[PDB]
Amino acid sequence: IAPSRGSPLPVLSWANREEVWKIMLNKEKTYLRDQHFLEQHPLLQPKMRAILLDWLMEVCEVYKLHRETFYLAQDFFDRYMATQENVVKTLLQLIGISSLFIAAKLEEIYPPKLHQFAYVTDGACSGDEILTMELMIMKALKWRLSPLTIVSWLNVYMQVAYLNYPQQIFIQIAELLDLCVLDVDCLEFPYGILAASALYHFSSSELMQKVSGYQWCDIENCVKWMVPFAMVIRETGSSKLKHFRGVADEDAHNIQTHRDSLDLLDKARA
Amino acid sequence: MENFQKVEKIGEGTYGVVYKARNKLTGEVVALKKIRLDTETEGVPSTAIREISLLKELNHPNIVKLLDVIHTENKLYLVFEFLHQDLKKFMDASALTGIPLPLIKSYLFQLLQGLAFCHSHRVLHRDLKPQNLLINTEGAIKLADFGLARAFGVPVRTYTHEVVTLWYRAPEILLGCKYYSTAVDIWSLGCIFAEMVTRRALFPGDSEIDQLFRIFRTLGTPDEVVWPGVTSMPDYKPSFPKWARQDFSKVVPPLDEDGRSLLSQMLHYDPNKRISAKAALAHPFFQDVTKPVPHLR
Numbered sequence: 001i002a003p004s005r006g007s008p009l010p011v012l013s014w015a016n017r018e019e020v021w022k023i024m025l026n027k028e029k030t031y032l033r034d035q036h037f038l039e040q041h042p043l044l045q046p047k048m049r050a051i052l053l054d055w056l057m058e059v060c061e062v063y064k065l066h067r068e069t070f071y072l073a074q075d076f077f078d079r080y081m082a083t084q085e086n087v088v089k090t091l092l093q094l095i096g097i098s099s100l101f102i103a104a105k106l107e108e109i110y111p112p113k114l115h116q117f118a119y120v121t122d123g124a125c126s127g128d129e130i131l132t133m134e135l136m137i138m139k140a141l142k143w144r145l146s147p148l149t150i151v152s153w154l155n156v157y158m159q160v161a162y163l164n165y166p167q168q169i170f171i172q173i174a175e176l177l178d179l180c181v182l183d184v185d186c187l188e189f190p191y192g193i194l195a196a197s198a199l200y201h202f203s204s205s206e207l208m209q210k211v212s213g214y215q216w217c218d219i220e221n222c223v224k225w226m227v228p229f230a231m232v233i234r235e236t237g238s239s240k241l242k243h244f245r246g247v248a249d250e251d252a253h254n255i256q257t258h259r260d261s262l263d264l265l266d267k268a269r270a
Numbered sequence: 271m272e273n274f275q276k277v278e279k280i281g282e283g284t285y286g287v288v289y290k291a292r293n294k295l296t297g298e299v300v301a302l303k304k305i306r307l308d309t310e311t312e313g314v315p316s317t318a319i320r321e322i323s324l325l326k327e328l329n330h331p332n333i334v335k336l337l338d339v340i341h342t343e344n345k346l347y348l349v350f351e352f353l354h355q356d357l358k359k360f361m362d363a364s365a366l367t368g369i370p371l372p373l374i375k376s377y378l379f380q381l382l383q384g385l386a387f388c389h390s391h392r393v394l395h396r397d398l399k400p401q402n403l404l405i406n407t408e409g410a411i412k413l414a415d416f417g418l419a420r421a422f423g424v425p426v427r428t429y430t431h432e433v434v435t436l437w438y439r440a441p442e443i444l445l446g447c448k449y450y451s452t453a454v455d456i457w458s459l460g461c462i463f464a465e466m467v468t469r470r471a472l473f474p475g476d477s478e479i480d481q482l483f484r485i486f487r488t489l490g491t492p493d494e495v496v497w498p499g500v501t502s503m504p505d506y507k508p509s510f511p512k513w514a515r516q517d518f519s520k521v522v523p524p525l526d527e528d529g530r531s532l533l534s535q536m537l538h539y540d541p542n543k544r545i546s547a548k549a550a551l552a553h554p555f556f557q558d559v560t561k562p563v564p565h566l567r
């Protein structure tokens with residue numbers, strides 16, 4: 001819904017750039033966000049979501065899951081909660097782990113087995129409960145499990161740049177988005193805007209507009225909101241691209257990593 | 271699921287049985303895929319989740335429709351629209367008489383429209399074989415069986431232990447390419463276009479090397495000139511016999527010059543130069559079935 005947004009996609013041999021871009025734009029019109037969904041769950045507090053999302057991120061690193069798998073789980077969780085009411089703290093771990101289970105099954109070629117998802121809960125969630133919850137989430141989402149995640153938008157933008165060390169820049173911008181996503185207020189902004197604003201903080205308005213099509217006016221508010229987060233990241237130095245056994249060097253940037261971002265989130269909000 | 275009456279078993283896969291079923295109150299016919307969740311160790315099969323989600327996003331007249339998903343007790347039912355026949359049974363039924371060239375052209379045009387739509391959604395089908403192409407009695411044909419489909423926002427890799435088609439497998443896959451591309455779907459459609467014309471599988475290999483040599487005997491042994499990089503591919507061998515490209519007048523006699531032009535571009539060795547689905551729709555072979563629109567800018 002951004003009348004001032006241009007199309008940054010280069011000419012493509014495999015398809016019509018206009019139709020490719022249009023499908024990407026229409027996703028934001030099917031997959032909604034509600035930064036106030038926790039108001040439907042009075043016994044929940046925003047920090048709980050940050051803690052849950054940070055833990056799933058650490059699960060992802062341990063099993064070397066892809067960044068897309070983590071962001072699919074985050075989008076599934078946030079969209080699912082928006083359809084529910086009066087959920088309590090003791091059920092979040094199961095909702096989160098089942099969201100990751102669905103995500104891993106969709107995105108990984110050889111996903112971890114269900115018993116491994118139960119294992120990481122350390123006796124808190126059984127396999128039968130995850131099987132029950134996955135069906136609950138999928139039906140409540142009306143089986144719409146193909147959004148354009150925050151991190152998938154980063155890949156679109158960085159691919160437009162490359163087709164005009166990119167891996168290290170990607171994981172550094174990804175690290176900033178990983179921090180921002182822990183704050184439920186990030187849902188005020190379209191996933192595409194969040195990705196463009198994080199990229200802007202590691203680049204320029206000119207590159208941002210070239211790779212995303214957004215004008216400065218469309219990202220300014222997100223950019224202002226993201227300011228504290230970009231600053232705590234810049235202050236500590238950004239992380240370095242890591243190597244993963246069994247993962248090809250060409251795909252290493254797409255593997256989810258984890259750092260102690262909960263202390264960074266506090267400093268940023270301060 | 272109480273308003274559906276099972277009429278006949280029409281298939282069976284790793285994850286379930288497929289039934290033709292009739293809606294008792296409306297009389298509409300559907301294809302039901304029954305997943306027995308009791309025997310599923312990992313919950314809803316990953317392939318089922320992916321296919322359901324993809325089909326909800328991919329709505330197009332040339333793509334089989336997913337009408338509903340019904341979770342009964344212990345069972346997940348995938349309710350698909352019903353089409354009476356797959357392209358393989360239609361071609362076999364037409365082996366003696368042959369398929370009229372105008373129906374061949376119309377079918378291929380429709381297949382390319384559905385494929386172009388998939389590629390526009392950044393999705394590779396990877397399993398386009400006549401058994402996965404469904405036809406109705408109104409002259410329409412649709413893409414089906416998206417179980418092997420994958421999105422390519424990031425490169426889709428080749429895996430040694432994945433079961434994929436052989437007769438319709440592209441040569442770059444056979445020669446060990448690390449990744450799939452939209453071109454593998456165009457290659458499959460090219461094999462199918464030739465099969466519709468001749469009523470015989472174009473490359474019916476019985477092993478990976480047999481499949482490769484069959485392609486070489488028809489299109490000629492590739493070299494760096496027709497396909498830059500061939501000599502550097504993992505499974506390439508300088509020992510490969512040198513065969514000459516056959517004349518397409520003998521490979522597909524019933525086809526005219528325009529049809530032979532399209533087929534050669536759909537069967538180009540270089541995945542980088544093989545015609546795209548949107549480009550194939552613009553080929554002169556389809557000038558009678560379509561007319562462009564005015565372009566802005």
Ligand SMILES: C[C@@H](OCC1CCCCC1)[C@H](NC(=O)[C@@H]1CN(C(=O)c2cncs2)CC12CN(C(=O)[C@H]1CC1(C)C)C2)C(=O)N1CCOCC1
Binds near residue numbers: 010012166167250450
């Ligand atoms: C360009 C590279 O990204 C550079 C990276 C990005 C992240 C940081 C470092 C640099 C590369 N990706 C692609 O080419 C993807 C995958 N595609 C396919 O697979 C195809 C299959 N059939 C036809 S195209 C097409 C592709 C999807 N796409 C678009 O939608 C176009 C409209 C866009 C500009 C956004 C372009 C990649 O990811 N590589 C990592 C591993 O090996 C090296 C390369």
